[PDB]
Design an enzyme around this catalytic site. Structure first.
Site, PDB file in Angstrom:
ATOM      1  N   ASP A 188      43.842  18.596   0.252  1.00 55.66           N
ATOM      2  CA  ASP A 188      44.668  18.619   1.452  1.00 55.66           C
ATOM      3  C   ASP A 188      44.875  20.040   1.955  1.00 55.66           C
ATOM      4  O   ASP A 188      45.284  20.926   1.196  1.00 55.66           O
ATOM      5  CB  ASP A 188      46.026  17.977   1.180  1.00 55.66           C
ATOM      6  CG  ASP A 188      45.916  16.533   0.768  1.00 55.66           C
ATOM      7  OD1 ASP A 188      44.869  15.912   1.039  1.00 55.66           O
ATOM      8  OD2 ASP A 188      46.892  16.017   0.189  1.00 55.66           O
ATOM      9  N   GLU A 229      39.846  18.514   3.335  1.00 55.07           N
ATOM     10  CA  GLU A 229      40.085  18.094   4.736  1.00 55.07           C
ATOM     11  C   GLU A 229      40.439  19.324   5.573  1.00 55.07           C
ATOM     12  O   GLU A 229      41.357  20.070   5.183  1.00 55.07           O
ATOM     13  CB  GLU A 229      41.168  17.013   4.787  1.00 55.07           C
ATOM     14  CG  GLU A 229      42.559  17.510   4.449  1.00 55.07           C
ATOM     15  CD  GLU A 229      43.429  17.704   5.676  1.00 55.07           C
ATOM     16  OE1 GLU A 229      44.639  17.929   5.510  1.00 55.07           O
ATOM     17  OE2 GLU A 229      42.890  17.625   6.795  1.00 55.07           O
TER      18      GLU A 229
END
Ligand SMILES: OC[C@H]1O[C@@H](O)[C@H](O)[C@@H](O)[C@@H]1O
Ligand SMILES: [Li+]
Length: 470
Positions: A188, A229
């Site tokens: 993340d 991501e």
């Protein structure tokens, strides 16, 4: 890792718990999906588990680790490694506050007093989520005032990556999780973690890649795949493909929204010719559509056409550094609840090289609810409505959802996708995507100005080519 439609979903948003999700997933989506990305369970003060006190635990209300293990045994498992930040409530942060400066954890947390006096030019140089400085004056137990640097919510604390304790906290998280059987882990907000003065501090070359490789190597020994991501120009996603960590298909949602809006296949097809490999391909997601993911892929003239023809139940867009930064709507309401258009969108996604990933509100063809968002005060919450299981049942009793399910099952079931992709010639208002594995072959043809989705496939039991309208 198996090449079947996955599912991004919450541990508590659908059902009262993770087991309740398992009951529904076994009852339906047993043959349609073959993977599962579950948004975090572990206890968090902010961002729906995006700021856990520890990855080493599962929140009790959501469920128990064994229920997650049961999902791991049957399907693929993907969960979030918040590589950038950890909770302030988290014990390592709590220990640092208790010991003040003299804590092993404190070296792992980033301190802004270390950088000296930052220039105004250097300050403006920083990549900004919000319009307050990304700093955090901490109240120590010592009764003293120090400064740590954090990108998102104050409760989340950024951990710098000059202390090896960062990499080691990571490695212990990865150890626990990969032991619990997680097939894949998404890194993340990886770009934010590199920080330098006189630098954007986002995606800095090539240290960010080096940090990503070390996490990936630990995961590979672990046997868990890495899906970092990033919301930035696709070139960064291409770099992730070179790394072998899986790239995200953030460009395709707004690309397809435009292509369906204007009945225009040209940019979609160029992108298809050149799209990054090892991609995991989304449409509807748990966040919004951060526009910079489509830039270059779609011209600014066409992004403006899309953004204008949006403004009308339909999207709401909040922008901090841009006229439009993000737009939050359910994909169904993005396409004005036209179900033929939505079916064509999902089909195009599924024939796109990579591992397709359907979102839960997308799977139930859910329309956005303003009221949950209003009580929360959170934008993205129009895409994160809570489902009860009978709501579930009656919603899978919708014709669009059942068409979608037929589609999802075929893509996971069919042999040809395991082969090579060959995109076919077509006019600028329709698209033709083919897959050919060995004898097996399947072929999506979408008319974009009429929203008609015709797939021709060869079935071994028949031994002959067959044509259906999904
Ligand atoms: O922690 C803040 C952010 O981290 C990253 C995740 O993909 C986001 O969903 C989350 O909001
Ligand atoms: Li790979």
């Amino acid at each position: 890792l198996k090449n079947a439609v996955q599912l991004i979903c919450y541990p508590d948003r659908i059902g009262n718990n993770l087991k309740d999700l398992y009951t529904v997933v076994d009852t339906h989506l047993s043959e349609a999906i073959g993977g599962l990305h579950i948004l975090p369970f572990f206890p968090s003060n902010a961002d729906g588990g995006f700021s856990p006190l520890t990855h080493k635990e599962v929140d009790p209300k959501f469920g128990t680790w064994d229920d997650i293990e049961a999902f791991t045994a049957k399907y693929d498992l993907c969960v979030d490694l918040t590589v950038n930040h950890i909770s302030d409530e988290s014990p390592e942060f709590k220990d640092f506050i208790a010991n003040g400066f003299d804590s092993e954890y404190a070296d792992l947390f980033v301190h802004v007093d270390k950088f000296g006096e930052i220039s105004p030019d250097d300050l403006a140089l920083i990549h900004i989520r919000k319009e307050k400085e990304p700093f955090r004056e901490v109240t120590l137990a010592d009764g003293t005032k120090t400064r740590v640097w954090c990108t998102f919510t104050e409760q989340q604390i950024d951990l710098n990556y000059e202390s090896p304790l960062a990499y080691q906290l990571m490695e212990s998280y990865i150890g626990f999780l990969t032991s619990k059987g997680v097939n894949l882990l998404r890194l993340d907000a990886f770009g934010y973690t590199t920080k330098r003065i006189g630098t954007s501090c986002f995606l800095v070359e090539p240290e960010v890649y080096q940090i990503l490789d070390w996490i990936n190597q630990v995961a590979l020994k672990h046997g868990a795949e890495c899906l970092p991501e990033v919301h930035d120009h696709i070139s960064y996603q291409y770099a992730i493909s070179r790394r072998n960590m899986h790239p995200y298909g953030f460009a395709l949602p707004p690309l397809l929204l435009y292509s369906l809006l204007d009945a225009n296949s040209t940019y979609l097809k160029n992108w298809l010719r050149m799209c990054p490999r090892n991609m995991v391909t989304v449409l509807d997601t748990h966040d919004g559509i951060c526009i910079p993911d489509v830039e270059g892929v779609l011209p600014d003239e066409k992004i403006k056409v899309l953004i204008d023809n949006i403004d009308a139940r339909s999207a709401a867009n909040i922008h901090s550094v841009g006229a439009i930064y993000q737009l939050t709507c359910t994909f169904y309401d993005a396409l004005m609840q036209n179900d033929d258009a939505y079916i064509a969108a999902r089909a195009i996604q599924f024939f796109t090289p990579g591992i397709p990933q359907v979102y839960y509100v997308g799977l139930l063809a859910g329309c956005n609810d303003h009221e949950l968002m209003e009580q929360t005060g959170e934008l993205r919450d129009i895409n994160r409505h809570y489902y009860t299981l009978e709501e579930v049942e009656q919603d899978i009793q919708k014709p669009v959802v059942q068409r979608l399910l037929s589609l999802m099952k075929f893509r996971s079931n069919y042999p040809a996708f395991d082969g090579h992709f060959e995109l076919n010639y077509s006019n600028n208002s329709s698209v033709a995507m083919a897959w050919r594995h060995g004898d097996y072959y399947c072929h999506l043809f979408v008319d974009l100005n009429f929203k008609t989705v015709k797939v021709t496939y060869t079935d071994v039991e028949t031994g002959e080519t067959r044509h259906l309208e999904c």
